[PDB]
């Protein structure tokens, strides 16, 4: 049966609650389609600061794992390493144990027990098996949920709720037919290791910007990024003003009230429109007073990425086994009508 899992909006990502071990140790971790391995901080993890203000053990603030209290833990005597786009990293030991999520249990789930990391907390990677940072192929949560007979396929639906929403939902092996308008549209996954889809164009406030490229739909990314000229064209339409941060690096700003829409044209005639306001974020001076303008939550990068500020505007069904991603404009509702992903 489809495993409905509650997502918690923590302002820069969406987390889920899982249990680990025979004692079902409660940990909270980031749901990330942009990686493939699940890792949780060890009870004695060494959290290293990456941001400014990172307190003592900020990374074990959502629980931690102690193999010792788990009658069913199993050290695999294999080192684990993984790096992420934002530069943070995680180092640990591979283990196997009973992992619980949304009322279901995954037996002998391989995952990593980290002793050093600069991430905010544990990360539940659910991408392609070929995306694992492990030097070999194993069963990650999705494939494991399928192999054990819980869900039909290594696949799940992502329902990042609305920007102001407190919770969202991700469904392993299911689809909540009542949370998306119109009809879902299939998009073939264009990469063998990353959850990428083809992007034809982007229309900003009436401005057509050809893309003819691939873009990463990643729940594990806070904002969105695009290639140099593409991002600059979007910034041009928006009318962004260039500023510099405390490091002398370029940053774009714009009037929070800036009107308009950003229409992402995907293949198979799928178009998702996202109001420019969803890409603007208001910061404040220490005096609580508003900054003159909002920050443009779109920066340039070597890769094209669409994260949370985009996905909240859509219902995303990732079908890893059938190598395809289906999308449709979202419909915000408590109501639900879940069916299995076939």
């Amino acid at each position: 049966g489809p495993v409905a899992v509650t997502l918690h909006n923590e302002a820069i990502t969406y987390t889920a609650d899982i249990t680990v071990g025979s004692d079902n140790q409660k940990l909270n971790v980031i749901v990330d389609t942009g990686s493939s391995d699940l890792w949780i901080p060890d009870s004695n993890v060494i959290c290293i600061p990456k941001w400014r203000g990172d307190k003592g053990d900020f990374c074990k603030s959502a629980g931690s794992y102690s193999p010792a209290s788990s009658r069913t833990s199993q050290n695999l005597n294999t080192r684990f390493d993984i790096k992420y786009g934002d530069g943070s990293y995680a180092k640990g030991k591979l283990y196997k144990d009973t992992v619980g999520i949304g009322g279901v249990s995954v037996r002998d789930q391989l995952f990593a027990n980290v002793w050093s990391t600069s991430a905010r907390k544990g990360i539940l990677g659910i991408g392609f098996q070929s995306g694992e940072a492990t030097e070999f192929d194993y069963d990650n949560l999705p494939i494991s949920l399928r192999n054990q007979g819980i869900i039909g396929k290594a696949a799940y639906s992502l329902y990042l709720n609305s920007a102001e929403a407190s919770t969202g939902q991700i469904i392993f092996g299911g689809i909540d037919k009542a949370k998306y308008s119109g009809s879902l549209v299939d998009l073939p996954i264009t990469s063998e290791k990353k959850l990428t889809v083809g992007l034809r164009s982007v229309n900003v406030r009436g401005r057509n910007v050809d893309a003819n490229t691939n873009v990463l739909l990643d729940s594990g990314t806070t904002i969105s990024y695009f290639t140099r000229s593409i991002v600059r064209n979007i910034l041009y339409a928006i009318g962004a003003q260039m500023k510099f941060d405390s490091a002398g690096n370029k940053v774009y700003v714009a009037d929070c009230k800036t009107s308009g829409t950003i229409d992402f044209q995907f293949g198979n005639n799928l178009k998702i429109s996202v109001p420019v306001s969803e890409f603007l974020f208001q910061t404040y001076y220490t005096s609580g007073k508003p900054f003159p303008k909002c920050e443009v939550r779109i920066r340039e990068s070597e890769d094209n990425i669409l994260g949370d500020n985009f996905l909240r505007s859509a219902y995303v069904v990732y079908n890893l086994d059938d190598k395809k991603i289906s999308m449709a404009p979202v419909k915000y509702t408590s109501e639900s009508d879940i069916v299995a992903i076939n």
Binding site: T13, D37, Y84, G85, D86, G125, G131, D218, T222, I305
Partner: peptide, 6 residues
């Protein structure tokens, strides 16, 4: 923010 794996 974050950007999740190389």
């Amino acid at each position: 923010x974050v950007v999740x794996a190389x």
